[PDB]
Amino acid sequence: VINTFDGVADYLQTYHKLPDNYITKSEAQALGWVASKGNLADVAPGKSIGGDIFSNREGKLPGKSGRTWREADINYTSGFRNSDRILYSSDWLIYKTTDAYQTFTKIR
């Protein structure tokens, strides 16, 4: 149980898996997600959105003819997302943002 960037990295860099509380939008949506509400702590108490894939649809992440990028919410409790997000690359690269994907700074 954790929701910090380094915490997710340590946990993921050690177990090749996201913290025991990260669910993708895919499942969140099929689970019953609604824009005019943005539910989460209700259908998933003590959990956060993350695990999908970030097709670098922003040109703010390093690409390569053979690699993938994924995103995950950061600093969450009970309500909706925010501007803090962490980006983890298939090349073992850790990228973090704080204005909602607007800018981006590398941490590991």
Swiss-Prot record:
Gene Ontology MF term list: RNA binding; RNA endonuclease activity
Keyword entries, A-Z: Endonuclease, Genetically modified food, Hydrolase, Nuclease, Secreted, Signal
Enzyme class: hydrolase
Annotated EC: 3.1.27.-
Compartment list: Secreted
Cellular component GO terms held in the UniProt record: extracellular region
Annotated active site: E71, A100
Application in biotechnology: Introduced by genetic manipulation and expressed in male sterile maize and rape by Plant Genetic Systems and in radicchio rosso by Bejo Zaden. Barnase expressed in transgenic plants will specifically destroy the tissue(s) where it is expressed. After cell transformation, protein expression and plant regeneration, the active nuclease destroys the pollen producing organs thus rendering the plant sterile.
Protein purpose: Hydrolyzes phosphodiester bonds in RNA, poly- and oligoribonucleotides resulting in 3'-nucleoside monophosphates via 2',3'-cyclophosphate intermediates.
Family membership noted in the UniProt record: Belongs to the ribonuclease N1/T1 family.
Name assigned to this protein: Ribonuclease
Source species of the chain: Bacillus amyloliquefaciens (Bacillus velezensis)
Organism placement in taxonomy: Bacteria, Bacillati, Bacillota, Bacilli, Bacillales
Boundaries of the shown chain within the full protein: 50 to 157 of 157
